């Protein structure tokens, strides 16, 4: 059976998930420089928004240096190959924010919910489909429920109109067989035409390994970022994933050297807290803690004179979900009281 090879969809999240690593301080020159490189490299999409999605700028998650719409408009002016993607979390961003982001240039939207809460995505997915956007469902903290339950939530977003479903390993807690389990569950219940995306985090050093396995199990889209720029120990490092994909003979359609150069020449120098696996980010992956909590826990650790790892371990015990950064100070205050 002689058939055309599968073309992988490469979704860069350097300007959205990577916003967490720089505490949402990208300049307009930064986003233009990064988008130009990515677009030259021929990635399929460039995701742009605050790390917590549209209207994530806040005291809870940190304020952005610019608004999401300013960043989107800046990127739209520099690119001609890739589409602009954005992230929207019901409870934080709204359909009105999605309308404004579409007006600014976004054409792909990933509507993200905690893995058990996909029914809050209905109106956003239906609105995005009415706008003619590439509409994607995105399930956060995907290690928290079994593969068949996650698939049922994915099928619910499919029923709302999403044409792609992602699993996001927000806590960077999964290993390769957990990825296999989830990909098989999705493929068993979704329509054959519905795309599947992988969004791995690197907290256990398996961001690229998990992406490779996702693709071997049939996934269509892979989220990654230059130098892994992203929450916790970062996302799967895009230049690394593409180097491996290239050695495997996979049809990824991007330019490897452009990505390798952009990662170290443009993106890496913007880091002020190195995006790597270390005691703290390994603690996120081990405990299965939402990766964006990293810097907020390091800030609380320095303010209250505690160890960041002790804060993360307790957050793991508390079973917090995405968006619950206010519980980081709660845990820190409780640890101080406990120690007294």
């Amino acid at each position: 059976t002689f058939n055309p090879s599968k073309k992988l969809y490469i979704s860069d999240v350097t300007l959205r998930d990577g916003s967490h690593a720089i505490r949402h301080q990208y300049t307009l020159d930064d986003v233009r420089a990064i988008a130009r490189a990515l677009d030259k490299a021929k990635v399929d999409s460039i995701e742009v928004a605050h790390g917590d999605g549209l209207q994530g700028s806040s005291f809870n998650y940190g304020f952005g240096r610019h608004t999401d719409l300013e960043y989107i408009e800046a990127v739209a002016g520099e690119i001609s190959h890739a589409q602009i993607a954005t992230l929207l979390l019901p409870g934080i961003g709204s359909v009105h924010d999605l309308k404004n982001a579409y007006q600014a240039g976004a054409r792909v939207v990933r509507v993200a919910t905690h893995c058990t809460e996909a029914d809050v995505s209905k109106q956003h997915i239906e609105y995005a489909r009415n706008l003619g956007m590439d509409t994607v469902g995105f399930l956060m903290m995907s290690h928290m429920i079994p593969a068949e339950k996650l698939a049922e939530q994915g099928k619910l977003m499919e029923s709302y109109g999403a044409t792609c479903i992602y699993m996001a390993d927000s806590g960077g807690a999964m290993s390769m067989n957990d990825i296999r389990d989830r990909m098989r569950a999705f493929k068993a219940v979704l329509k054959p035409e519905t795309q599947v995306g992988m969004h791995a985090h690197h907290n256990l050093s398996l961001g690229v390994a998990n992406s490779i396995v996702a693709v071997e199990e049939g996934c269509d889209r892979v989220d990654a970022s230059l130098a892994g720029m992203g929450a916790g120990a970062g996302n799967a490092p895009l230049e690394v994933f593409i180097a491996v994909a290239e050695r495997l003979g996979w049809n990824h359609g991007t330019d490897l050297y452009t990505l390798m150069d952009a990662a170290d020449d443009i993106v890496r120098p913007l880091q002020d807290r190195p995006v790597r696996v270390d005691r703290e980010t390994l603690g996120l992956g081990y405990a299965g803690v939402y990766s964006s909590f990293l810097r907020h826990a390091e800030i609380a650790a320095a303010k209250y004179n505690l160890k960041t790892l002790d804060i993360l371990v307790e957050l793991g015990h508390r079973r917090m979900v995405g968006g619950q950064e206010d519980m980081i100070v709660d845990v820190a205050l409780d640890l101080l009281a406990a120690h007294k």
């Binding site: 209207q55 700028s57 806040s58 005291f59 809870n60 304020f63 952005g64 240096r65 610019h66 608004t67 300013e70 019901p90 409870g91 934080i92 709204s94 359909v95 009105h96 905690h114 058990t116 809460e117 029914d119 809050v120 209905k122 109106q123 508390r318 079973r319 917090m320 979900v321 995405g322 968006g323 619950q324 206010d326 519980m327 100070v329 709660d330 205050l333």
Partner: protein, 312 residues
Amino acid sequence: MNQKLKVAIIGSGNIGTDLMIKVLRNAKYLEMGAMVGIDAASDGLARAQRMGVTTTYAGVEGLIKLPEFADIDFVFDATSASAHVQNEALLRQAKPGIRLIDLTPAAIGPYCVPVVNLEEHLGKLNVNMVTCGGQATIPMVAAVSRVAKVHYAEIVASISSKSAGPGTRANIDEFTETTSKAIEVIGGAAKGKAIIIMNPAEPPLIMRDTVYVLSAAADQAAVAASVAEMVQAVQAYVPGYRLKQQVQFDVIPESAPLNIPGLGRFSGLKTSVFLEVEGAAHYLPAYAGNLDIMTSAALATAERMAQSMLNA
């Protein structure tokens, strides 16, 4: 007292059923007239029946036809923001002087947060109760705004997934929008923001609300004492509402202002209030203080409206 006015509750779900138990047990000027649902198998209707309350599963057109409707003067809407529009429409045509107390974020009537403005809209025939997050956190915003000018106020409400029924899950954008607007209008903040998060953890989590308030420079002891007075005031309605932590403060010098993109470059004081809200466990268990903070507010508003009409 003895002479009470009758009420209907439309929505036999988490909020409506907790509100019915509060009317039954604690209302002084009001008494149950009917519980109205659209699902014959709804747990709330079964509960209403066991407690002797008249029920209908024929919606608001069904309520308008009960014999009891002739004597119902108040209606509490605990359905969903989209359904309130039609509910108000129908009830208003059937009985022009009926009082609607809206527990959804539709907000076709003005906002009421009792510890801040209970007396303000007592003559209005449609009053909106904001949201659970609003009722829990607007008092803390007002507590700061009565000490110092507030530039920006942000609330984060986290509730157990099991306590948020379908009605809540169909109006999440309206939750953020109505709550933000009410933080400005009632709380006194120049700009408001509201976030809602559901967490399905087991044992179910107690509602938590965190309020971040950016004001001009102010005396920290005065802000803390004002917060404490306001917590005491809300506790007269909801005993399990309490600080989980002492009020936290961060000074923001004018030499190193905080940039809120497109809003301003601010200096002064950041006040952080960490609340937890334990409910009375009338319907769901004590972790669901998110029901109580709304239902106690809605009942207090209608009770005061009734008091005013029965005793000028």
